[PDB]
Amino acid sequence: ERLSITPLGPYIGAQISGADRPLSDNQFEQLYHAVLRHQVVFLRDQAITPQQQRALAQRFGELHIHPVYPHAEGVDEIIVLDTHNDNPPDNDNWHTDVTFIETPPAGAILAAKELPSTGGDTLWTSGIAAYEALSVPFRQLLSGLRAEHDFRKSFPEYKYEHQRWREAVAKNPPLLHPVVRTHPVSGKQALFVNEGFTTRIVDVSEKESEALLSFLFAHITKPEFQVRWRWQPNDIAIWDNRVTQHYANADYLPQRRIMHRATILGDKPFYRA
Amino acid sequence: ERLSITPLGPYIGAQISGADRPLSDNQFEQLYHAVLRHQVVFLRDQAITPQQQRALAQRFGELHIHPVYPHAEGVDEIIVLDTHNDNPPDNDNWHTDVTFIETPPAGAILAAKELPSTGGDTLWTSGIAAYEALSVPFRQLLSGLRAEHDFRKSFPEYKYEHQRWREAVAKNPPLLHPVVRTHPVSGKQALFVNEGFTTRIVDVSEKESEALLSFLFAHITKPEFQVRWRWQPNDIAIWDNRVTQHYANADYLPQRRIMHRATILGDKPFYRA
Amino acid sequence: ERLSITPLGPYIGAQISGADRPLSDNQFEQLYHAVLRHQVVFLRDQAITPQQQRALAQRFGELHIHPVYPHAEGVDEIIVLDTHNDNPPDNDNWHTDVTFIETPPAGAILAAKELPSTGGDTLWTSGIAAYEALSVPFRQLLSGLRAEHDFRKSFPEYKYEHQRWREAVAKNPPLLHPVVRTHPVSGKQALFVNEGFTTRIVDVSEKESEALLSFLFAHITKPEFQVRWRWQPNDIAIWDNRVTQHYANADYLPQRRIMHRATILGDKPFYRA
Amino acid sequence: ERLSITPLGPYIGAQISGADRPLSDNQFEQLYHAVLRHQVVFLRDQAITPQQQRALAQRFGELHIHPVYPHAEGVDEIIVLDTHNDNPPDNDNWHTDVTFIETPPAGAILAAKELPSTGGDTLWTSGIAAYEALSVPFRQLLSGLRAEHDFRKSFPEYKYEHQRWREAVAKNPPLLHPVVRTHPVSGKQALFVNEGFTTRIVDVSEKESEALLSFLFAHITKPEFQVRWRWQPNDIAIWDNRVTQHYANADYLPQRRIMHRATILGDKPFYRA
Numbered sequence A, B, C, D: 001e002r003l004s005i006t007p008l009g010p011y012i013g014a015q016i017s018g019a020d021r022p023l024s025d026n027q028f029e030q031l032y033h034a035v036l037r038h039q040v041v042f043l044r045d046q047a048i049t050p051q052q053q054r055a056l057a058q059r060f061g062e063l064h065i066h067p068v069y070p071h072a073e074g075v076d077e078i079i080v081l082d083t084h085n086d087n088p089p090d091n092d093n094w095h096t097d098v099t100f101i102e103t104p105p106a107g108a109i110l111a112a113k114e115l116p117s118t119g120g121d122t123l124w125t126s127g128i129a130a131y132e133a134l135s136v137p138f139r140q141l142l143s144g145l146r147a148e149h150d151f152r153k154s155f156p157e158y159k160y161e162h163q164r165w166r167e168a169v170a171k172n173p174p175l176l177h178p179v180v181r182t183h184p185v186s187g188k189q190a191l192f193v194n195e196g197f198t199t200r201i202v203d204v205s206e207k208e209s210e211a212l213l214s215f216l217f218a219h220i221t222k223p224e225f226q227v228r229w230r231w232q233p234n235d236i237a238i239w240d241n242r243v244t245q246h247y248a249n250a251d252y253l254p255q256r257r258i259m260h261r262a263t264i265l266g267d268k269p270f271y272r273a
C-alpha cells in the first residue's frame, strides 16, 4: 500500500503514516526513498520496543555501537538517552552523528520514549541546501578541502570512566573528511562539517580555517535550511546522517526525557563532481 | 467559555481554539493574557476579512499604517503582503516590526490568505528568554545602553516612488531605544535590538558596539529561544511585538504567497529594574 | 652617485640618503626602483617646498587633485593635511589612497612639515606579502573576485560644503576593482581591498562577502606585513599606492600636525596570472 | 648622572643612554622609573654577558626559571632563544610572558645577541592605553571578571621530552587572573588578558566569553597602543610584563637569531578601583 507522505518544507523534512510489526518490502522501499528525498522523516504513534527498533535499523545497513553512550537492556545497538538533573543533555549543538570514525553512520532512528511537558525540540539542517546556497566561487573553494574531526571536541576529557574514556579516545583518533561530500546514493553535493566535531580545515592557514568554519558553522543555521520537530510520545524520527546536522534543545530540566537511538553505519565519505 | 491553549514550548509560543464573528469580552481577556504569557499565539481555520481583522486589532489598541507597504482594499490599517517573482520577499531576516518610530507597535495580527506548496515558514524568537540567558555581568552591561534604529536599514534607498520613499524617510529619522526593554505590562526584562533596524549601540565605542551587536544578533538565534510555524490557509498569528523578533523564510518563489497584517501601536519603550 | 638604501625589513620598507634641488636622472632611477623593491621609502632632512614636491611627484607620472582635502598655497596638486582640535585626524584606519576612482594613484609623496611632540606615527602594510601568505585555495578563491569601493565609506555624508560634497560624490560613484591585483610594472600578485573604501566583494553572497572582508581586513594587520615610521620634521615618505595600505595614528591631539601630500595617478588596476 | 630618555610615543615606549658594568643606584632609580613611565625601554650598544644580565635583572626582583625554554651556559635564570630551521620561532603571537603561574613576572630583560639580515622585529602593546580606550560601560563590564590562563595554550602537547613536558604541565595547571589588573606600583588600570594564554573569561557564558575575547584580542592590536623595535646587535630591551603584551615577528628563517632573556618574578595580579 502507498504511504502517506507530507513534506514539511521545500527542502529537508517530511511526515508519514505506515505501520511499524515489520515492513512489507514494498513499503520499506517507499520509506527509504522518502528518507532520501527529504533528509528527515517523522512518524507518530509507533510504540516500538528496543529489539523492534534495531530490527528496522538493520533493514538499512549494519549498525554501530556508540563507544560512550549507554545501551538498552539487551540491545547494545540501541543507544538510550535518558536526560535529567543527574545527567544533563549534551546534544544542544549542531552536529552530525558520529563523524569521528572513518565511516560515519549514514542514518539513525530515534524513538520518543518518555517526554517532558514541552521543549526537547529537535531540529535538522540540510547540508545539500546549505551547499546550493554557496556562491560559485565558494563552492569551488570548499569542494576539495578536508577538515579534521575529533571525537574529543564533543566529548571532552574533563567531563569524565576516565579509563573507559581514554579507551574510546585512542580507538577513535582525529581523522579527515571532505569539506564537501558527495552523496553515495543521490550523488548530490553537500557541506560536510559540523560544529560538533570539525576542528579545522586542514588545507588552509590556521586563521583561514578559523575564518571559514565561523562562516560555515553559522551558514548552516539559516532557518530556510531546516526543519523543527515538536516531540510527542512514541514518535519516530529517521534521517540521512550523511547530509544533515541536527540540534536538540536543552530546555526541559529538571524534568526527565528518554530517547532510544538506532545508529546505522554508512560507507566512507568522498567528494566527486 | 474557556479557550483551548496548547503551549508550543517552555518559553515563547502556543496554539488556541476560539471562534473569530467578534469575541465575547471574557474570551478576548483569555486571548490577551495568552498573547502575553507566550509571546506568540496561533489560530487555524479563521477565514476572516480585512475589515474583520482590523476590528480584532482595535480590540488591543490604536493601529498603525505602514509608510511603505501597500494596504488592503478600503482598509489602510491592514497591510497586504503579496509576494512572488515581480515582488520578492523582504522579511527573511530577524527583525521586530516597525521599531524606527518613537512608539514601536506592541503587537500585530497576521492572516494567512493565500499560501504556496510549502515553505514560507515564519519563526519567532523571545527577547525575554534571550535576556534571561545572558550572564549577570552582561545583563548589567546591556541594561541601560541605548541603540539607534534606522528605518533605512531594512528599507534601503537603492531598492526604490523614490519620492514617496524620501517622504517616509524624513518623516521617520533614526532614533534611540533601550538595548534592554522592560515590559509595559508584564514588567519582565528583554533584549530589544533586532538585526532588522538596530544600527549601533550609541553608548560604547564603534568597535565595541560592533562587537556587541554581532553577539546579540547571533544570540537571539539560539533554537531554545524560538518557535516555528508552518503556515496553513486561514491561519491567524498574533504576537507581542515588544519582546520578540521574527523571521519569515524566503523559499517559495516563483510561487505566490499572500498575507494580511494588522499593525498595532504600543507605548514608548523604556527600561527600569 | 649611488644612493644609500637601508631596508627596514624582509618585505615592505626602507630608508635612503640622496639630495632633494632636482634629481639626476641616474638617481631618480635608483629611487624609482627603490620605491618599487620595497613598497615604501623614507628620507630625512629634506626641507622642500610645495612647488618643489609637486616637481618630484611629476617625475613619476601625472598628478591627482583630491576632491575634498584642501590644497597648498598655489599648488592644487599638493594636498595639505593640517590636523588639530578644530580638524581632527581622519586617517587612523587601514586604507589605500583614493581607490574610489577608476584609476587609483600608483604613488604619493608625504612631507613632514610640522610635527607634534610624538605620535602621529604612520604604518604601511604590504599587499604583496599579505597575498603570498594566503593558502593556495584562498589565492584561487580570491584571484578573480571583484570588490566595490565607495568614496562615501571613508567620507560619509554626515561629516559635511554638503553641496561641495554631493558634487564630489556624484562625480565619484562606487566602482569595481579586482580583489587580487597584478602589478603594472613588477607583475607581482597582491591583495587589493582596503578597509577604507572596500564595501563588499560583489561576486559572492552578502554573508560570504561579509565573512571574507572581515578576514582580509584583519589579515593585512599581521605585523610581519608592515613597517612603522616615527615622524621627524622635513621627513619624506614615498610609497607605491598600488600594492599597499597605510595607517596614520591619531594620538597627538590637541597638538597640531602638518603634512603635505603629492598624489600621483596610476593606470587601471587589473588581474592576470 | 642623568640618563638620556627619548620617548617613542605618547604612550608605551622609549630609548635611553646609560652604561651597562653595574649601575650607580642613582641611575638604576632613573631607569626603573623609566621602565615604569613607558612600559618598554630600549638601549643600544650594550654587549653584556649572561652572568652580567642576570645581575641587572636581580636589581629589580627575584628571577624566574622557565620550565621549558633552554638556559644559558651556567645561568639558568637567563633563557636562551636560538631560532632557525631546526627550531622555528614560537613568539609570533600577542602574549604576556608567563601568565600561567600564580605570580606572573613583572618584568624581563632581552639581549640582542646574534641577529638576522632584517626582520625579527618585536612589538609591545600597552594594556594601560588599551584600557583607557574602552568605553565606560565596557570598563565596568570588564573590571571584575576573571579569565583562565593555560600554559598548554602557548605550549601544546603535540609539539613535544613529552615526559619533561607533562612535568611542567602538572606543575603549572590553568589558573585565574583578573581581566582588568591594577598596577602594584603605579596603581593604573590595565587590560590583563593575552591571546597567548587566556582561554576564556570564566565569569560569563561560553559564547559571551568567546565574543569578549575576540574583541579584546583584536582591541590590543590597535597601532596607537604600541611600539615597534627594529633589532640591532647588543641591543637591550627592558619592559614591565604586568601591563603589556608583545609580539616577535617570524620572518627571518632560514637565518639564525639568538636572544637572551632575564625573566623577573612579580607579585600576584589584583584589581582594585
Ligand SMILES: O=C(O)CCC(=O)C(=O)O
Pocket: A081, A091, A097, A110, A120, A121, A122, A246, A247, A248, A259, A261
Ligand atoms: O534527544 C534528542 O531528541 C536527540 C539527541 C541526538 O542528537 C541524537 O540522538 O543523536
Ligand SMILES: O=C(O)CCC(=O)C(=O)O
Pocket: B081, B091, B097, B110, B120, B121, B122, B246, B247, B248, B259, B261
Ligand atoms: O510573511 C510572513 O509570514 C511574515 C512577514 C512579516 O515579517 C510581517 O508581516 O511582519
Ligand SMILES: O=C(O)CCC(=O)C(=O)O
Pocket: C081, C091, C097, C110, C120, C121, C122, C246, C247, C248, C259, C261
Ligand atoms: O598624516 C599622515 O602621516 C598620513 C595621512 C594619510 O593617510 C595620507 O596622507 O594619505
Ligand SMILES: O=C(O)CCC(=O)C(=O)O
Pocket: D081, D091, D097, D110, D120, D121, D122, D246, D247, D248, D259, D261
Ligand atoms: O625574540 C624576541 O625578540 C622576543 C621573544 C619573546 O617573546 C620573549 O623573549 O618573551
Ligand SMILES: [Fe+2]
Pocket: A091, A095, A096, A097, A246
Ligand atoms: Fe545527534
Ligand SMILES: [Fe+2]
Pocket: B091, B095, B096, B097, B246
Ligand atoms: Fe515582520
Ligand SMILES: [Fe+2]
Pocket: C091, C095, C096, C097, C246
Ligand atoms: Fe592615506
Ligand SMILES: [Fe+2]
Pocket: D091, D095, D096, D097, D246
Ligand atoms: Fe615573550
